[PDB]
Amino acid sequence: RGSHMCDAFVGTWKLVSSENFDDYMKEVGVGFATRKVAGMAKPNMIISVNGDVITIKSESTFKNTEISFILGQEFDEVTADDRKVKSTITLDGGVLVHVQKWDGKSTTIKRKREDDKLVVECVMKGVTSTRVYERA
Numbered sequence: 001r002g003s004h005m006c007d008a009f010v011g012t013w014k015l016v017s018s019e020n021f022d023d024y025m026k027e028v029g030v031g032f033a034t035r036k037v038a039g040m041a042k043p044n045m046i047i048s049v050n051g052d053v054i055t056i057k058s059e060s061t062f063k064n065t066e067i068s069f070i071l072g073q074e075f076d077e078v079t080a081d082d083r084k085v086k087s088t089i090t091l092d093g094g095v096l097v098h099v100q101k102w103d104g105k106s107t108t109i110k111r112k113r114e115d116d117k118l119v120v121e122c123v124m125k126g127v128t129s130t131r132v133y134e135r136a
C-alpha cells in the first residue's frame, strides 16, 4: 500500500491539556468515583494504520483500552468508563468523527490535527470538552 491521509494521526501522543472534561463526563453519565479517577489520568494515545484498519490505543493509570475499526463500519466498543456502545467512525474533511450510541444516548468525539497537536473534542448535548495531545 501507499500513504493515506489518515497517516497524519499515526504515532504516539501524550495528553498535555484538558478543559471541561469533568462536565463532559457528567453529561455522559459517568459516576462520581470513576469521574474523579478518570479525570486525573494523563493518557498516552497510540494510533496506527494497517491497510483499511485503524487502531487507537489509550494507555493510562486509569485504564488501557483499544479500538480497531474500518471507516464507516459500525463496531462494538467498551469505553474506559465501562459503557457498552455502538460506534461508527468516519473521516470528514481530515477530521475523524466518532459517534457512540448507547441507552438511547449519543456522544461525538472528533479527533483532528492542529499544528503539531492532536486535538480531541468530546461533545454531549451542548457540553464540549477539549483534550490536547502532543507527540510523545
Ligand SMILES: O=C(O)c1ccccc1Nc1ccccc1-c1ccccc1
Binding pocket: 015, 025, 038, 039, 041, 043, 058, 060, 062, 063, 079, 080, 081, 109, 120, 131
Ligand atoms: O481521554 C481522552 O482524551 C479521550 C479521547 C477520545 C475519546 C475518549 C477519551 N476519554 C474518555 C472518554 C469518556 C470516559 C472516559 C475517558 C477516559 C479515558 C482514559 C483516561 C481517562 C478518561
